[PDB]
Scaffold this active site. Structure first.
Site: not given
Lengths: 306, 4, 305, 4
Positions: C44, C266
């Site tokens: 991010k 993830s």
């Protein structure tokens, strides 16, 4: 972008350097900061974990599948657990039962075995248990406070990196918090050889200012203030000592996080506080370098960011 | 007690 | 690397590591790109800097302005980190379910927190950010619509992999879909250079929206938004691999113990899917995936508890 | 609920 490697330990080292632009006065020396928390394991200890393991490999003292033991409740445990998982060694750490579940799960996530020692005995009981496993059962103990591979890896990687990064410039002052002292001693040896007029400054907690001839004590600067003079610390390498208190270090870490966008541990806040004072003493045109050993995320459960 |  | 002037200049150029033990040599090579090596700790970092920079260059914001975003995950960390580094005020809306440790992380960067009813989850946080933006002129990057999100992976992440796998062919690229920016930007670049590359989307088995399934609760943090984001190119991928919560957790644990690579849940989903594709492709092939976050950010989660 |  570096080309692909086949082992995560091949990423250790080569950490970046960032100039501070806000928390340091414009009328002071430039302050540069080496992000040792960019090591893949999260701290400077990545370097000495790999170095101590690979030195023992080179010397034939250990081979893959062997068991390593170290009494540590700090970043050397994470670095060793990380390196042992990557290279195929069985890591065992002795630590008082007091340690947090987060840190224990972190080490166990790397597949390390934990030998939990009496909480009332603290580090003394952890060191004692490591000695028993070393002496009575032949576990290899790296011994981060005596092993020459600790300051030598900073001689052969960390120090040279700073030479390569500050080529075309001179470094007028290097500062580093002293835990094992391997960082200050190894890079200080290399920088003094290249910059004979550099100031090497040891940083230690004001609560345990042992290096300043002072008296041991309890502090919150995790990674520093071992309470003794480690064998891996070259007590001749530093020209002066700057002592930092707990609240000053925490306030500087918070300021660097909010004003520079660099979230680092409390010991990094102590290093930056000392580097700013030294930079104000040297004034414009001078270059001051220090090391950020760990990230602030590793301490979100501490009063540093609570 | 230290954390190194 | 020579000294940089701002921590944001460290964003990108993340390393790639070959897997040795969780994947057998009778399968394709599996390489993982460590996006948690970004200075803020996650993939991010890239889109936080890109969205702030684009609006900055467009004149929508100047330093001192406040940024608002509805986020409970790594985009809030990335935005708080970039905002603190570049002189912007940050406000984040979030349900009351968010942990105190994550609240402390955002506050550490100087961000302000506005809490929404926990039973409303992200729906309430999104609505609160819209009111804050439309009534106060705050800039909302809007990670699920902003084209700068897939574009930065088009401009950096993708070309990095072409750079890193020069002289070789990537036979399959796989990525978990949160906003879909990574898969879309990287897949576009890789398909242009490797026309026969297999692009595979990864999504939770418990919330398989891309497969046309019903949304639902899952534990694959960073994935499974419950909807198809506008930042996802739903044509870039040639197949979908669904991964369950237990499979993702166990793979993350295995990779940490056997590779020394500690990544988020993830990333365990991504590595599991990449290993299945590697078994399917067989020896001699090259499989590449992305690890979006580090496992140390999830020590309070059952992933390592 | 999602964490993105």
């Amino acid at each position: 972008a570096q080309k692909p490697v086949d082992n995560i330990t091949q990423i250790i080292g080569g950490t970046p350097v960032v100039k501070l632009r806000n928390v340091v006065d414009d009328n002071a020396a430039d302050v540069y900061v080496k992000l040792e928390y960019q090591n893949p394991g999260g701290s400077v200890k990545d370097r000495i974990a790999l170095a101590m393991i690979e030195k023992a490999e080179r010397e034939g003292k250990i081979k893959p599948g062997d068991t390593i033991v170290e009494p540590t409740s700090g970043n050397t445990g994470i670095g060793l657990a990380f390196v042992c998982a990557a290279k195929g060694y069985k890591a065992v750490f002795t630590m008082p039962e007091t340690m947090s579940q987060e840190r224990r799960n972190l080490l166990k996530a790397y597949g390390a075995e934990l030998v939990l020692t009496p909480g009332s005995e603290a580090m003394k009981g952890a060191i004692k248990k490591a000695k028993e496993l070393k002496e009575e059962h032949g576990y290899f103990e790296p011994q981060q406070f005596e092993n020459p591979a600790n300051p030598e890896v900073h001689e052969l990687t960390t120090g040279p990196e700073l030479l390569q990064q500050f080529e075309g410039k001179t470094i007028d002052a290097f500062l580093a918090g002293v835990g094992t002292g391997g960082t200050l001693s190894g890079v200080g040896k290399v920088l003094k050889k290249e910059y004979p007029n550099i100031e090497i400054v040891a940083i230690e907690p004001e609560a345990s200012p042992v290096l300043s001839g002072g008296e041991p004590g309890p502090h919150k600067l995790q990674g520093l203030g071992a309470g003794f003079i480690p064998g891996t610390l070259n007590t001749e390498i530093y020209d002066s000592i700057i002592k930092v208190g707990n609240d000053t270090a925490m306030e500087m870490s918070r300021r660097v996080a909010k004003e520079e966008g660099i979230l680092a541990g409390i010991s990094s806040g102590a290093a930056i506080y000392a580097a700013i004072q030294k930079a104000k003493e040297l004034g414009k045109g001078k270059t001051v370098v220090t090391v950020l050993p760990s990230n602030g995320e590793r301490y979100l459960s501490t009063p540093l960011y609570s | 007690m230290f954390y190194i």
